[PDB]
């Protein structure tokens, strides 16, 4: 009856409101994905409750246990009805859950500290003075792991052997490390996050080059679900009324501090 | 057994090869969508035959007869198995057919003759010296028709009353009219086509501003079809192996004459 929407803390998708400790239920949270979930639930006509996923992950299958973790896992095992999050639409995920058409478009991109002499992945690849890394798990790591393009294989071989580790746990962590490494560390992250951070004080980062790939985030539901179709048409309607553009502007640029 | 793939002539998606009159079947054609269809059919393991849609349309429902026309129509009425074309993923279409995840990302955009004093839709909207129009039917017309954003309503009201008609039949026609109007006509078209034309001689056009929206083209199949799922995973695989990027580069930029 009250449907379970699994989500995850990630700025500016889902964040605690300033006085969250005095608040209850969905009121604790705000952000792009909270507003999206509200809009979708209005069109599909459902009451829902946002739940932060317990294990803090997006969704991968353990090669040993074959268990899906994260939000994908909550859907696969029947413990959530919908996931609304910056969940990258990937083939291994699409094989076990259903994604809506993308609510957001993006690509893997490069974050540098202002003044770093790097404009492209090719600049990074041909050197070692400036270190570079992805998140430890997620779709970006996986892009590099699986790539068969020369530049990207190089980069992956470099990252997978670099001492000490170039990979980081969270967006915050990768960003802190760009900001503290005096130009000697670039972070490979999705363009959406990169763009957001660039408009945040201290305004010492920038996105450089084009993106390395082209993909989307999708709202996810379990296979066979009766919410699949209405959720999909809901994303398209919202896209077509301009509401997805409006919410991106709201959370990325209306408040931009740079 | 040999599955019917409906398509349409549109450069550089599907074009006649130089010696097409001496050739037979799928060999008559080349382009981005011909290569896509080949790649998809390889992964899904199907033999197929490309058919140019008889009525030369993409897909709309007549408000009087309720008949779907064009490629969408061929799928809806059972006369084609798959459509592979620059078919924009729209809600009214998604309600009657199935689209794969997008194979290409894009948006409505502005084409000007080089030297026209226009950088944005806002520049166009606030004036009449420089005329502007969309194709007569398609997703772009429909964007403007349905928009509730102020700038775009203005533009739509202007276009729907302008004398003589600002709307044109085909991409070629809109382009010819940009090129012959001495800077007094701008064409609103999808960014993909705009980008292609900009790399074609006489190199007298350019794309200006950002896009007005964000959407994709999808491969389409009839609702309930056994090819739906494999086609969808096939697009994602191809996206993930870099083949969609490779084909775009091939048809848009490898040969670019500007
Ligand atoms: C925030 C992180 C862990 C997520 C967000 N989208 C990707 C995902 O859906 O896997 C991850 C980012 C990345 O891999 O660069
Ligand atoms: C080539 C034309 C008629 C097609 C291509 N995509 C759009 C469609 O799928 O409707 C149309 C373009 C447009 O509306 O600007
Ligand atoms: Zn707190
Ligand atoms: Zn000919």
């Amino acid at each position: 009856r009250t449907i379970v929407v699994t989500t995850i803390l990630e700025s500016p998708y889902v964040m605690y409101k300033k006085n969250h400790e005095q608040l209850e239920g969905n009121e604790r949270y705000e952000g792009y994905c909270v507003d999206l979930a509200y809009e979708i639930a209005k069109h599909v006509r459902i009451k829902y409750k946002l739940s932060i996923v317990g294990d803090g992950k997006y969704g991968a299958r353990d090669p040993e246990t074959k268990i899906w973790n994260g939000m994908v896992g909550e859907l696969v095992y029947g413990r959530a009805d919908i996931a609304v999050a910056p969940l990258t639409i990937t083939l291994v995920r699409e094989e076990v859950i259903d994604f809506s058409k993308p609510f957001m478009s993006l690509g893997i991109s490069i974050m540098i500290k202002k003044g770093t002499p790097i404009e492209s992945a090719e600049d990074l690849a041909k050197q070692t003075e400036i270190a570079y890394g992805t998140l430890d798990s997620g779709s970006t790591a996986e892009f590099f792991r699986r790539s068969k393009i020369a530049v990207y294989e190089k980069m992956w071989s470099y990252m997978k052997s670099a001492e000490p580790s170039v990979f980081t746990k969270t967006t915050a962590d990768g960003v802190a490390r760009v900001r503290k490494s005096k130009g000697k560390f670039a972070f490979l992250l999705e363009s959406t996050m990169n763009e957001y951070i660039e408009q945040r004080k201290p305004c010492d980062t920038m996105k450089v080059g084009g993106n390395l790939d082209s993909k989307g985030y999708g709202v996810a539901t379990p296979k066979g679900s009766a919410l699949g179709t209405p959720v999909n048409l809901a994303v398209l309607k919202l896209s077509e009324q301009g509401i997805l553009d409006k919410l991106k502007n709201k959370w990325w640029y209306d408040k931009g501090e740079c």
Side-chain angles (χ1 to χ4, degrees), chain A:
Chain A
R1 185 43 38 170
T2 289
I3 89 102
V4 180
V5 178
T6 188
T7 191
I8 195 162
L9 295 186
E10 176 72 20
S11 295
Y13 301 95
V14 190
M15 316 187 275
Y16 284 128
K17 289 203 196 147
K18 192 164 60 58
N19 50 173
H20 70 111
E21 280 171 14
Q22 296 180 305
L23 293 171
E24 298 166 316
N26 301 346
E27 305 296 317
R28 294 166 285 170
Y29 312 107
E30 64 180 3
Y32 178 95
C33 281
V34 181
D35 287 352
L36 185 56
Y38 175 83
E39 295 290 338
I40 296 179
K42 195 201 277 176
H43 285 299
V44 171
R45 298 236 264 137
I46 53 167
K47 296 174 329 295
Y48 62 102
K49 207 251 201 304
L50 297 165
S51 299
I52 303 313
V53 64
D55 77 355
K57 316 201 157 273
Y58 283 78
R61 198 186 66 143
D62 189 292
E64 173 63 12
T65 68
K66 323 285 201 103
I67 294 169
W68 282 86
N69 70 20
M71 296 181 282
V72 169
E74 301 294 295
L75 295 171
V76 161
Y77 306 109
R79 296 186 292 276
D81 297 298
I82 308 171
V84 186
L87 193 65
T88 300
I89 293 166
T90 60
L91 167 93
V92 291
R93 292 177 178 152
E94 183 80 287
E95 288 174 343
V96 299
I97 55 81
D98 280 341
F99 279 118
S100 78
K101 296 301 188 293
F103 61 81
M104 201 165 289
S105 293
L106 59 311
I108 293 159
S109 70
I110 299 161
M111 183 189 278
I112 57 154
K113 189 165 196 294
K114 272 168 174 199
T116 309
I118 286 137
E119 299 173 357
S120 68
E122 284 87 336
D123 290 344
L124 290 174
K126 74 174 205 282
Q127 61 85 68
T128 35
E129 188 132 311
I130 303 152
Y132 55 90
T134 66
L135 293 164
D136 50 22
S137 54
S139 59
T140 306
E142 188 70 33
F143 172 82
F144 277 99
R145 187 182 291 111
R146 301 300 167 210
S147 188
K148 302 301 193 238
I149 309 106
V151 64
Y152 308 136
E153 277 169 319
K154 199 166 184 187
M155 288 172 67
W156 181 236
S157 176
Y158 160 84
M159 291 183 260
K160 221 183 32 290
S161 67
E163 226 71 79
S165 190
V166 296
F167 308 100
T168 62
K169 290 173 184 310
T170 69
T171 302
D173 284 355
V175 171
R177 183 160 176 188
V178 177
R179 296 180 160 154
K180 296 156 111 157
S181 300
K182 279 185 253 275
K184 302 292 200 194
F185 185 68
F187 183 31
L188 296 145
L189 78 169
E190 287 171 340
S191 46
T192 51
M193 277 70 159
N194 194 357
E195 287 170 324
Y196 172 73
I197 291 305
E198 189 168 43
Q199 302 299 335
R200 301 284 298 182
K201 299 211 294 180
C203 303
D204 58 352
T205 64
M206 72 181 294
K207 195 218 282 159
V208 283
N211 295 337
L212 285 50
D213 62 1
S214 296
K215 51 206 179 177
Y217 304 138
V219 172
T221 48
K223 276 203 185 322
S225 166
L227 286 173
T229 294
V231 162
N232 187 55
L233 304 179
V235 170
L236 289 181
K237 186 180 308 314
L238 294 176
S239 173
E240 281 177 14
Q241 296 167 164
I243 301 274
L244 307 178
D245 290 345
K246 184 175 187 206
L247 294 173
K248 168 88 127 98
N249 191 66
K250 185 180 166 175
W251 292 103
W252 267 252
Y253 302 107
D254 280 350
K255 310 150 202 258
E257 314 157 328
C258 302

